[PDB]
Structure 1
């Protein structure tokens, strides 16, 4: 199916530029996809809706009377 590549016996194996450009292209498209999604949809990681502070609410809205009425 492929081309003839010979053994080497203690030196680096023969590499085709095809597999090199293919691996680089797929790694590059992985990183491009990650960056593109982070730019276009960043709310999936950092969140979009703020978390309220429970102590910052006032007793007016929480149904609290000054400890004397009821």
Structure 2
């Protein structure tokens, strides 16, 4: 009607604007920068445990 910014297609894989893919790429990394604090430094159970608490004598 007014604008032709993105073309119509007939299944020919119309291409992207090649600027959204930069911001798409950036936030796929800072989410896996957050794999740092998953283990480093964080463990599954920072508690200590019980030796099957038997020795009542």
TM range (shorter): 0.5 to 0.7
- Separation (CA, whole Å) in 2 of partners of 1:28 and 1:41: 20
Deviations 1:26-66 (A, max 9, x none): 1111111123432222346998999878999xxxxxxxxxx
The runs of 5 or more residues in structure 2 that have no matched partner are none
C-alpha deviation, 1:8, in angstroms: 2.1
Aligned to 2:18: 17
CA RMSD of aligned residues (A): 4.9
Aligned to 1:64: none
The runs of 5 or more residues in structure 1 that have no matched partner are 57-70
The TM-score with structure 1 as length reference comes to 0.47
Task: Mark the CA change 1:23 to 1:55 in structure 2 (over 3 Å): closer, same or farther.
Answer: farther
Q: Report how many residues are paired.
A: 56
